[PDB]
Design a protein around this ligand. Structure first.
Ligand SMILES: *[C@@H]1O[C@H](CO)[C@@H](O[C@@H]2O[C@H](CO)[C@@H](O[C@@H]3O[C@H](CO[C@H]4O[C@H](CO[C@H]5O[C@H](CO)[C@@H](O)[C@H](O)[C@@H]5O)[C@@H](O)[C@H](O[C@H]5O[C@H](CO)[C@@H](O)[C@H](O)[C@@H]5O)[C@@H]4O)[C@@H](O)[C@H](O[C@H]4O[C@H](CO)[C@@H](O)[C@H](O)[C@@H]4O[C@H]4O[C@H](CO)[C@@H](O)[C@H](O)[C@@H]4O)[C@@H]3O)[C@H](O)[C@H]2NC(C)=O)[C@H](O)[C@H]1NC(C)=O
Ligand SMILES: *[C@@H]1O[C@H](CO)[C@@H](O[C@@H]2O[C@H](CO)[C@@H](O[C@@H]3O[C@H](CO[C@H]4O[C@H](CO[C@H]5O[C@H](CO)[C@@H](O)[C@H](O)[C@@H]5O)[C@@H](O)[C@H](O[C@H]5O[C@H](CO)[C@@H](O)[C@H](O)[C@@H]5O)[C@@H]4O)[C@@H](O)[C@H](O[C@H]4O[C@H](CO)[C@@H](O)[C@H](O)[C@@H]4O)[C@@H]3O)[C@H](O)[C@H]2NC(C)=O)[C@H](O)[C@H]1NC(C)=O
Ligand SMILES: *[C@@H]1O[C@H](CO)[C@@H](O[C@@H]2O[C@H](CO)[C@@H](O[C@@H]3O[C@H](CO[C@H]4O[C@H](CO)[C@@H](O)[C@H](O)[C@@H]4O)[C@@H](O)[C@H](O[C@H]4O[C@H](CO)[C@@H](O)[C@H](O)[C@@H]4O)[C@@H]3O)[C@H](O)[C@H]2NC(C)=O)[C@H](O)[C@H]1NC(C)=O
Ligand SMILES: *[C@@H]1O[C@H](CO[C@@H]2O[C@@H](C)[C@@H](O)[C@@H](O)[C@@H]2O)[C@@H](O[C@@H]2O[C@H](CO)[C@@H](O)[C@H](O)[C@H]2NC(C)=O)[C@H](O)[C@H]1NC(C)=O
Ligand code: NAG
Ligand code: NAG
Ligand code: NAG
Ligand code: NAG
Lengths: 110, 130, 116, 116, 116
């Protein structure tokens, strides 16, 4: 994929964790919006963030997006074992389909 | 709001397959129906989407020559909910086309995020063997 | 579109048509009733300080108990028909709060002018 | 408090409750009559330039012959019922003066519209 | 001058007198009808944002197809009676354009206020 993500991120329980999403400026993030998903293997994904700032319904306050032209970020506050899953970023526009990134794994320590 | 997909099926190479996506608990015509593929060697891939309302569809360039999308006419249950189904057909299956296929529906009726796959079906496996 | 043509549209989309619906022995009873119907809503706007306006912002804060929905969830994901049902039990409460806020504003502007 | 519950209160206290009273073949005639009374008062406010306001300041100076009471003697020492009785014979003079002041304002507004 | 006394005067002269003319079983029908006419005209002014004013400027540009006359040809050379005949077939079109402009204006005022 034109989008890339770090292979993995980690932190201790209760620690904040940040996940980057980057690519060519034409894909991320000039004139583009990035959405974020949880996607456990063997299971359907859940939408977490859309328009880089808005939480999807049913999503805990601990999840929040941040943005820069070079990269979109997802930050998870209060890291829990419940969040120990694979995440994907998706670049999108109102006139185009989703472009998925390579994804990242999140590990929870202690 | 729930989406239900056709169960897993085994195919020979070059075979066509048809996958249903039954819907309930929300108005079928109000949201875009998205299709997403996941394969271990490729990761998630967008297969495009079809509007249940206008019939308009947007296939990703990779799938424009192989994927056909259609929908059923919705049947109302309440003034604000209905049932119906979307279907997708894949022509000329390859071993590279194996893995889980998902049905999903659009997030909003309007705004720039309207087509995002907010709700997902459980997904089902497609297998190709000689 | 047309009269109520926007009824199935989203609440945000519907706002472009507000003027379409703002306009518009048994025959005599029909005529009197139409007048009472019209004046009922105009009376509320006059009390609220919203008279002459299609869209009128107030000083009353939204109470999340009335709805916990995000602005996208309301404006880009709902019809006005659905919205009225969601807050049907709170509509009169909201109306009274608007009236209380207007009367305090009228009083405060008077006091400002008394000082100046 | 309820409808007219403010009637025995001082004029200053009563002013906080104005919105409470702002609300609200024989049957048909009664319905028409109720509408005429509502509109009668609204027409006066429109004539005075006060339409859409619960409290409306004018450019008419208080004329001491109507009452010699100080503001404290009026606002904190009287009810509105008592006040109406004290100036009951001058209300028509006051209404006419308000209309005359509005007429001058409209002439000035017309000039301003052409200027800018 | 009195009610309709300006009718034979030019439109420009007449514009001065609008203040004067803004004022002023079968009886039941007469009373209902008088109310309907008052409210019909006020309903349009409220929708247009022109309520409370005798003269109301809008943001709608004049279409030369409605009339090719210069302002002097209209204001100093015509009665309002003659003018109404000239645009009798365009009046409803003009009204709709005013209404659309008001709704776009208030939507923009809302969006401006969202930034405060
Ligand atoms: C009844 O209910 C239904 C369902 O709720 C309502 O329908 C929903 O209506 C909303 C609002 O209109 C739609 O949202 C809008 O969707 C478009 C994107 O869709 C576009 O892409 C399609 C891609 O498919 C192909 O074509 C493209 C062409 O480039 C190819 O590249 C692809 O490869 C594919 O071949 C395209 O097909 C669409 O065009 C067709 O369909 C549309 C549908 O609405 C028709 O109008 C077209 O004529 C044509 O048939 C279309 O291009 C988004 O772009 C919209 O976002 C913009 O507009 C929003 C309006 O509110 C605005 O808020 C956004 O910010 C954004 O505006 C931006 O872009 C504008 C472009 O002009 C700029 O002007 C603006 O300044 C800003 O930059 C919007 O998200 C829903 O999709 C639609 N839902 C469904 C399922 O169809 C319906 O409205 C209801 N009816 C009534 C009366 O209420
Ligand atoms: C019914 O229709 C008629 C016809 O249309 C209409 O009469 C026209 O009225 C307009 C004004 O609305 C007149 O146009 C103005 O005339 C001004 C005055 O110039 C001369 O006339 C003066 C008298 O006019 C008034 O009184 C007569 C009756 O007496 C009446 O018919 C007029 O309508 C108007 O009410 C007169 O005093 C003046 O005096 C000059 O000549 C005498 C001769 O002895 C001399 O002694 C004086 O020293 C002086 O030289 C003169 O005779 C004119 O000033 C005015 O222009 C000024 O005002 C305008 C508007 O503010 C400004 O834009 C401009 O820049 C100037 O400041 C203008 O030209 C028109 O002339 C009338 N037409 C005719 C044919 O008489 C009636 O009003 C209509 N009635 C109603 C109720 O609507
Ligand atoms: C029916 O009629 C009765 C009698 O007129 C009304 O009762 C009066 O109500 C008014 C409004 O509440 C009272 O006005 C206020 O009285 C206060 C009395 O002081 C209290 O505290 C002292 C000790 O500090 C006690 O001794 C006393 O008994 C009271 O408990 C004043 O303190 C108030 O002054 C403050 O507010 C005013 C108004 O804003 C300011 O101008 C002052 O500067 C100050 O901030 C105020 O004067 C009045 O006293 C009551 N009268 C009596 C005899 O009790 C009823 O209200 C009326 N009912 C209705 C529905 O109208
Ligand atoms: C968009 O709305 C749907 C449905 O919400 C309901 O239907 C809307 C049209 C409107 O009438 C709302 O006021 C209604 O509440 C949302 O889908 C719901 O999501 C919740 C949480 O996951 C789920 O429990 C519901 O079952 C879903 N639908 C129904 C009918 O229950 C959808 O999330 C909204 N999209 C947003 C906010 O982005
Ligand atoms: C919010 O609404 C609920 C339900 O009406 C009410 O109990 C609560 O007091 C309200 N909160 C405020 C601050 O008014
Ligand atoms: C005040 O009112 C009296 C009685 O009507 C009147 O005679 C007097 O002229 C008025 N004063 C002014 C300035 O109008
Ligand atoms: C207030 O008005 C009442 C009723 O007229 C009167 O009895 C009382 O004496 C007045 N108070 C003062 C201070 O004038
Ligand atoms: C003028 O009127 C004509 C005929 O209705 C119309 O086609 C044209 O667009 C109008 N011009 C403007 C500026 O509105």
């Amino acid at each position: 994929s034109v989008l890339t993500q770090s292979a993995s991120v980690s932190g201790s329980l209760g620690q904040s964790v940040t996940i980057s999403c980057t690519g060519p400026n034409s894909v991320c993030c000039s004139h583009k919006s990035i959405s974020w998903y949880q996607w456990p293997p063997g299971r359907a994904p859940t939408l977490i963030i859309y328009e880089d700032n808005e939480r999807a319904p049913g999503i805990s306050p601990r999840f929040s997006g941040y943005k820069s032209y070079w990269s979109a970020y997802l930050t998870i506050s209060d890291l829990r074992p419940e969040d120990e899953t694979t995440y994907y970023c998706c670049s999108y526009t109102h006139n185009s389909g989703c472009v998925f990134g390579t994804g990242t794994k999140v590990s929870v320590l202690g | 709001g729930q989406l239900v997909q056709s169960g897993a099926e085994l195919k020979k190479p070059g075979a066509s397959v048809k996958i249903s996506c039954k819907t309930s608990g929300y108005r079928f015509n109000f949201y875009h129906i998205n299709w997403i593929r996941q394969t271990a060697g490729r990761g998630p891939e967008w297969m495009g989407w079809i509007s249940p309302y206008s019939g308009d569809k947007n296939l990703a360039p990779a799938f424009q020559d192989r994927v056909i999308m259609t929908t059923d006419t919705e049947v109302p249950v309440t003034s604000f909910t209905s049932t119906g189904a979307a279907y997708m057909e894949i022509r000329n299956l390859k071993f590279d086309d194996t893995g889980t296929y998902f049905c999903a529906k659009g997030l909003l009726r309007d705004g720039s995020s309207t087509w995002l796959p907010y709700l997902w079906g459980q997904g089902t496996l497609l297998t190709v063997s000689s | 579109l047309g009269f109520l043509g926007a009824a199935g549209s989203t609440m945000g989309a519907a706002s472009i048509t507000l003027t379409v619906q703002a306009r518009q022995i048994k025959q005599l009873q029909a005529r009197v009733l139409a007048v009472e119907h019209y004046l009922r809503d105009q009376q509320l706007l006059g009390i609220w300080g919203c008279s002459g306006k299609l869209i009128c912002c107030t000083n009353v804060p939204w109470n999340s108990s009335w709805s916990n929905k995000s602005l996208d969830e309301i404006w880009n994901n709902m019809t006005w028909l659905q919205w009225d049902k969601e807050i049907n039990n709170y509509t009169q409460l909201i109306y009274r709060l608007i009236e209380e806020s207007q009367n305090q504003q009228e009083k405060n502007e008077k006091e400002l002018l008394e000082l100046d």
